Symmetry: C5
C-alpha cells in the first residue's frame, strides 16, 4: 500500500551491497508476461549492467534484461538470450517494455514507444512463480552472489509487471501516462525491502 | 470473408517451410496491376529477402519484389528486373506501392508515400491469371522449391492488389488510411492458407 | 487550347529520337524573359542532361538550361555560359525559375523558391523570336542533331514563359500555386508536337 | 534593494583584478544548498575558467563550479571534485542549476533544463556560513590570490542561491521564468561590491 | 527623401570603379554608434570583401566591417581590429547589427538576430563626423584608392545607422521589420550618389 508515484530509486555509488527486493503475491506459474520500466544511467559507454533480475531456485537468470557494452540490450529467459542491437547510444531517460508469450514463443521489445522486430525464444516453457525480483544487481544465485561489475549506478522507476501480453494500444497508453491496473507488480501498491545505500527521491523524467 | 484489419502475419524464425498462400478469383489476363503492402524486418544489413512472390506455370518469377543487399529494391516482371537504389537503410516499418502498365511499360514505385522516378519494363506483355501468390519465400518453381536464404523474418500485412494503375491521389489516400475497394486481393475479404510456423498478431505500425 | 494542368511528360528510356516541341506565337524580338519549370530525374550522379532547349538559325544554344555533372546548373544565353554550383544532390522533384534582362544584364535563378546570387551575362543583346523550343535533347542545329548522352530521362512539366522579368512576389505566388497569365508559353493553352516515345501522365509532385 | 532584473555583469577583458563580491546574510551552517546562474563565454575551446567561487578560511574551494578544457563541468565541494562530461561544445548562453544534500550525499546538475545523472559527493559534511562569494576568478585564499588563466571573459547573471534542495518542478519553473523567493542570494535584492573593470548592461538572453 | 523600402543595390561584376557613397548631415563627433545592414554574396569561400566602409581624413579605416577568408567577420575601429569567427559558411542573405560605445569600450555583434559575446576595443576614443561612407569597396584614402580584390559582388540593402547603442529589444524589433527612426542614416530618407555599374532592384530577402 506504499504509493511510489512520482518517485524513483537512486543508486549513487558502485557497490555490491545496495539493492531493492520486490514481492509478488501470485502462485500460479506464468505462461506469458510483460514488464515495463524507466531507467537512467551513464554507464553505457563504460561497461554493461543489469536492469531487472528475476531468479528462481532452479535457475538464477530466469527473466533478465541486461545491457552489453558495444552491443545493446540482452533479453534472457530460461537461460536463453536474444540481442537487440542499438548502434547509437544516447544520454537521456529510457522507457522499456518487454513481453513474452509461451504458446507462440514471440518476444516483443518497445524502446521509448517505438517497437522492435519480433523474435522467438523458449516455446512451450513455464516460468516459476516463487521467485526473487531484484533491482540493483544481477543475481547469480537465489538472492545472492552479487557482482560488482554488473551493478547499476543511476535511477530506476515506474516498474510494472503483468501476467499477459499487452497490445500496442495499451503500450502506447502506458508510455503516454494513462491509467492501468497491473496484476503482478504495482507501482501504486508496491511491497519492497531496501538493503544497503539506496535512496527514494522525486523522478527526473516527466 | 476473413477480415484481417489491424492484424499481420509474423514469421519469427528463418526456415524454408513457413509461408502463406493467397488466392484470387479472376481469370481474365492482366494488362496492368498495382500492389501495396506493409512490412517490417531487420535483415537489410545481413542478406536479401522476398516481399511478394507471384508465380505462374511458365515463369516462376512473374511479378516479384525483392531486396538486394547493399543495393536496394528489385522489381521483376516476366523475368526482367529493374533496380531502385537506396543508400541509407532505416530500421522502421515500410509501406511500398508498385504499379505497372502494359501499353506504356511504365513502372511506378512509392516508398512511404514519396514517389520514385518512372522507369520502363516489359512493354506489350500479358501477365497470366492462374497463379500462386506466396508471402514468406521466393518460389523458384510453382508453389514449392523454396530458398532458405531468401526467406523473410519479421512482420507483413496490408496486402492489397488492383488490376489497374492508380493515380497519385489514390495512393496518398491509401497511405493515410482512407477507404478503398480492391478487386483482386482484399485485406477485408481475404482467402488464405497458412503452412508452417506463421502467426497472426496485432500490427505494430499505426 | 489543350489544357495540360495536373499532367506531365514522361521520357522513360534513353534515346535520341524522343522529344517534344513547343510553339510560341510572338514575333517581336525579346529583350527580357523568364522561364519557370518543374522536373524530376535520377541522372544527377551519372551524367549531364538538358532541361530546356531554345534554338535559332544562327545559334543552336540561344537559351539553354543544362546540368553539368559534379558541378551543377549551367545557364547559357547567346552562346555564353554561367554556372550555379550545388554541392549536395537531392532526390526529389525540382522547380526552377530563371530570368534575364538585357538593358542591365542581371540573371536571376530560383531553386525551390529560394533565390541565388545575381550574376551578369550578355548585356545589350537581343534574342530572336523565330525559334524552336524543345524538351528532351539539347539541339545542335535548328531542331536536329540530337545527342544521346545529353538526353533527359524522367518527368517534366509546368513549363511557363514570360517576355518580362518577374518580381520576387510573383515567383513566390507561382511556387505556391496561385494564378498567373503567361504571354509566351502557357501550360493551359499549349500547342505542342510529340515525336518518339513520350507519354502524358498525371504529375507526381503536388 | 538593488534590483538587477534584466541586467548582467560583463567582463570584456582578461585580467586578474576585475571581480564582483556578493554578500549573504545568514550565519547558520549549511547542510544543503542549490545554486542557479546564467552565463555566456567563448573560452570553451581555449582554456578553463571559473563560473562560481565560494571560499572560507579553512578551504578556498568550498563550493566551486569550473570548466575544464576538453572535459567539461567540474563541481567541487569541500575540496573533492566530480566531473560532468560534455563532448559537444556550443556557442550560446547556458543556464546551470546545481544542488547538494548532506544526509544523502547526492549531487544534482541541470544544464538548460535537462537533468544529468545523480552522483555522490561529501556525505555527512557541513559548509561554513562566513564566506566570500566571488564571480570572476577562482579564489586561492580568502578573497585573494587570483589567477589570470582561470578568469572569465563574458557575461554572467541570474545568480540565485537557496539553502535547501529544489524539486524538478521548481527547477522547470525557474528555467521558464516564473516567480520564486530565494533565501540566500536574491537577484532582486542583491548586495554586492564591484572591483576593477566590470560593467552592468542589459542581458543578451531572453 | 528617396524612399528605398523593398529595394536593394546590386553589384553584378568584380571591378574597381563601381560604388555608392552615402551622406550624413550630423557634425557632432561620435561617442557611440550602431550600424545595421543586410547583404548577400557568394564570395565567402573564394576571398574576402568589404561590407561597410567609413573613412576620414586622418584614418582611412575608421569604422570598417570586413570578411576574412577562413576566419570570419572583422570589425575595425580607429585602426584596431577584432575577429568574430564563424566556422561554418552558409549560403543565404545575412543581417548584421554592430554596436560600439566609448565610455566602456564594449563592442556588440548580432548575426541573424542572435548575439555574440561582448568584446572590448578603443576605449576613450572619438570618431570624426566629416567622413565618407562607401558601399562597394574598402577605401584606402578619403574616397579613393580602391582595391579589386576587396570589392563586393552581390546585393546590399537596409543600411541604417544610429548615434547611440541599441538595447536588445530594439535589435529584435529591427530584425522582425518593425518601425524605427534612425538619426544618422535612414533607408527611407537616403541621400546617395552612385558611380559606375550599380543597379537598384527589388530585394530578394523577405
Ligand atoms: C555460477 C554460475 O553463474 C553463471 O555464470 C555467470 C558467469 O560469471 C561467473 C560466475 O557465475 C562464477 O561461476 C565464476 O565463474 C567461474 C565458474 O564458476 C567456474 O566454473 C569456472 O571454472 O571459472 C569461472 C571464472 O571465470 O565467476 C564468474 C566469472 O559469467 C558468465 C558470462 O557469460 C555467465 O554468463 C554468467 O554471468 P551472469 O550471471 O552475469 O549472466 C549473464 C550476463 O550477461 C547472462 O547474460 C551461470 O550462468 C550460472 O547461472 C551459474 O552456474
Ligand atoms: C536461369 C534461372 O535459374 C534459376 O535461378 C535461380 C538460381 O537458384 C538456384 C536454382 O537452381 C534453384 O532451383 C536451386 O536448385 C537446386 C534445387 O534443389 C533443384 O533445382 C536441384 O535439384 O538442385 C539444385 C541445386 O542448386 O538452387 C538455387 C541455388 O540462382 C539464381 C542466381 O544465381 C537465382 O537465385 C534463382 O533463384 P531465385 O528464386 O532466388 O531468383 C531470384 C530472381 O531475382 C533472385 O533474385 C531460376 O530458378 C530459374 O530456373 C531461371 O530463371
Ligand atoms: C553547332 C556548332 O557546334 C556546337 O558544338 C557542339 C558539338 O556538337 C557537335 C557539333 O559540332 C555537330 O555539328 C556535330 O559535329 C559535326 C561537325 O561537322 C564536326 O564535329 C564533325 O564533322 O562531326 C559532325 C559532322 O560534320 O556533332 C556534334 C556532336 O559538341 C561540342 C562539345 O562540347 C559542343 O558542346 C556543342 O555540343 P552541345 O550542344 O552539347 O554543347 C553543350 C553546352 O553545354 C555541351 O555542354 C557549338 O555550339 C558551336 O558553337 C556551334 O557553332
Ligand atoms: C591548499 C592547496 O591549494 C588548493 O589547491 C590548489 C592548488 O593550486 C595552487 C594553489 O593552492 C595556489 O595557492 C598556489 O599554490 C601555492 C601554494 O603555496 C603551494 O601549493 C605552492 O607550492 O605554492 C604556491 C604559491 O605559494 O598555486 C596553485 C597552483 O593545486 C591545484 C593545482 O592546479 C589547484 O590549483 C588547486 O586549486 P585552484 O584554485 O588553483 O584550481 C582549481 C582546483 O580545482 C581548478 O580545478 C586547495 O586548497 C588544496 O587544498 C591544496 O592544493
Ligand atoms: C597606407 C596604408 O594603406 C592601407 O594599407 C593597406 C595595404 O594596401 C597597400 C597600401 O599600403 C598602399 O600604400 C600600397 O602599399 C604600398 C606600401 O609601400 C607597401 O605595401 C608596398 O611595399 O608598397 C606599396 C606601394 O608603394 O599598396 C596597397 C596595396 O595593404 C595591406 C595588406 O593587405 C592592407 O590591405 C592595408 O589596409 P586595407 O585597406 O587593405 O584593409 C585591410 C583589411 O583587413 C586592413 O584590415 C591601410 O589604410 C593602412 O592602414 C595604411 O597605412
Ligand atoms: Ca546471475
Ligand atoms: Ca552474474
Ligand atoms: Ca524463383
Ligand atoms: Ca531462389
Ligand atoms: Ca547546341
Ligand atoms: Ca549537343
Ligand atoms: Ca582555490
Ligand atoms: Ca587557482
Ligand atoms: Ca583602407
Ligand atoms: Ca585596401
Amino acid at each position: 500500500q506504499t504509493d511510489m508515484s512520482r518517485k524513483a530509486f537512486v543508486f549513487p555509488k558502485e557497490s555490491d551491497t545496495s539493492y531493492v527486493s520486490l514481492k509478488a503475491p501470485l502462485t500460479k506459474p506464468l505462461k506469458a508476461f510483460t514488464v515495463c520500466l524507466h531507467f537512467y544511467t551513464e554507464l553505457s559507454s563504460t561497461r554493461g549492467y543489469s536492469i531487472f533480475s528475476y531468479a528462481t531456485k532452479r535457475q538464477d537468470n530466469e527473466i533478465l534484461i541486461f545491457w552489453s557494452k558495444d552491443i545493446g540490450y540482452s533479453f534472457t529467459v530460461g537461460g536463453s538470450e536474444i540481442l537487440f542491437e542499438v548502434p547509437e547510444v544516447t544520454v537521456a531517460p529510457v522507457h522499456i517494455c518487454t513481453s513474452w508469450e509461451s504458446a507462440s514463443g514471440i518476444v516483443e521489445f518497445w524502446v521509448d514507444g517505438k517497437p522492435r522486430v519480433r523474435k522467438s525464444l523458449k516455446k512451450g516453457y513455464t516460468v516459476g512463480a516463487e521467485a526473487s525480483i531484484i533491482l540493483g544487481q544481477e543475481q547469480d544465485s537465489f538472492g545472492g552472489n552479487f557482482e560488482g561489475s554488473q551493478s547499476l549506478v543511476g535511477d530506476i522507476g515506474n516498474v510494472n509487471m503483468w501476467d499477459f501480453v499487452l497490445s500496442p494500444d495499451e503500450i502506447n497508453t502506458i508510455y503516454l501516462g494513462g491509467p492501468f491496473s497491473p496484476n503482478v507488480l504495482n507501482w501504486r501498491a508496491l511491497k519492497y525491502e531496501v538493503q544497503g545505500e539506496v535512496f527514494t527521491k522525486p523522478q527526473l523524467w516527466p
